[model samples]
Target chain A: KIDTTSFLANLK
Target chain B: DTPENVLQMLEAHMQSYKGNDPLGEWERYIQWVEENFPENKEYLITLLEHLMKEFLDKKKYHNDPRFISYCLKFAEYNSDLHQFFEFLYNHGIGTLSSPLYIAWAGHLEAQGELQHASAVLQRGIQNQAEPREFLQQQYRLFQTRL
Candidate 1:
């Protein structure tokens, strides 16, 4: 799946 | 606590909530209704639907951070409730350094909407949020993320 790990983990 | 009373109380005067937000209090109030009344979420959805119908008439409340979050949070998991997001994206929301543009872009990217995701990041840049430089920093990162 698309890796939202970085996006989700480091929002803001 | 009497969450029901608080929700009804807030809903009765929700008009006072707009633009009076050092803390998005009114926004949080409706949010409480959705969370605490999870069994009646569709009732909440109808409220949300009524709102978009009203606001979409003039793009009213589109720029408010709370309104933006209201859209995103409500948009989550309810595929048919995609209008708010489209409203945000198509109308250049999350201006003034809000991180939500990134959030929406990331959501779009995860769904494999590559071009539109790029559009979102660049929209953040055009809005001059995140200093343009770091906005582009994430723009590049979004490229990798995709």
Candidate 2:
């Protein structure tokens, strides 16, 4: 499963 | 849990979790009915129906030659009522033959992680090669269980 949190976290 | 997961209508909600493993989501799914009453009222029946139908077609998998599929299906429905008894007989390093996904879904549900539980259950239903009853009985059983 794609970790939704990890995606958002790297955006910054 | 595959790349195809992105196509789901709930993908946006899953994206809303700011943590890799959102504990809150886990709680919501584990305690799914109580946490997502609105969603349950609106869509759980449909979902449950799909799940029941998928599991009912047990005979087809028996004939399938794919060993992985055979083993998975066999573990998925091993004496539901006598789970502990089945586990004891089938235990391996403290693990039973039951599908890990089933317990993962349960853990998420217990944590009120409805989206994760929904994803897991929906996938299980969809992957079944054959579908049977509309899961009316299974839905009712869940209604009583939760």
Candidate 3:
């Protein structure tokens, strides 16, 4: 699973 | 976990700060939402959909892209709102900064809304939103997609 933190972190 | 648990957790965080440093509180709440809520797509979107009201109620982070981006992401999950992309674009040029949330414009294109998509990008360019060149190139690129 993709790490949600990395996903949201990069999203910013 | 049940929806009730999600509600309780969200509610707890909302008041956890008791009206102090709201932006910080929201940031914390968003982190919590992203982390714990991913497992339940329906419940997650439900929580975000509900939280959006409260977020607007307090009128915080209105212009902040980070917050609005989260709002856009949340809205994307709600299949019922056909006007979801417009909702974001309308809320503000999305046009707020750089290239103007062109993702939503791209979404319009994906739906085969060539005219509407072109309008959105043109509006962004007319507004002279940041990264003006980005808008220009997409205006050209979209033709190929048609």
**Model 3 fnat?**
0.00
Q: Cα lDDT of all candidates, in order?
A: 0.59, 0.36, 0.61
- Model 2, CA-based lDDT: 0.36
Docking quality tier of model 1: incorrect
Candidate order (DockQ): 3, 1, 2
Q: For model 2, what is the alpha-carbon lDDT of residue B19? A: 76
Q: Report the lDDT tens digits of candidate 1 across residue range B1-146.
A: 35445646765676565564423555565666676677756556545544444455344466666666665665663553234355555555546444666777777788888898898778778777755576777788888855
Model 1 TM-score (2 dp): 0.59
True contacts kept of each: 0.00, 0.00, 0.00
Measured against the true two-chain complex, the DockQ scores of the candidates, in the order shown, are: 0.03, 0.02, 0.04
Best by TM-score: 3
Q: In order, what is each prediction's RMSD in angstroms?
A: 9.0, 19.2, 7.9
The DockQ for candidate 3, computed on C-alphas, is 0.04
- What candidate 1 keeps of the native contacts, as a fraction, is 0.00
Assess the local accuracy of residue B34 in candidate 2 as a C-alpha lDDT between 0 and 100. 30
In candidate 2, position B43 carries an lDDT of 38
- When candidate 1 is compared with the true two-chain complex, its DockQ is 0.03
Residue B14's C-alpha lDDT in candidate 2?
A: 51
Candidate 1 at residue B87, lDDT?
Answer: 50
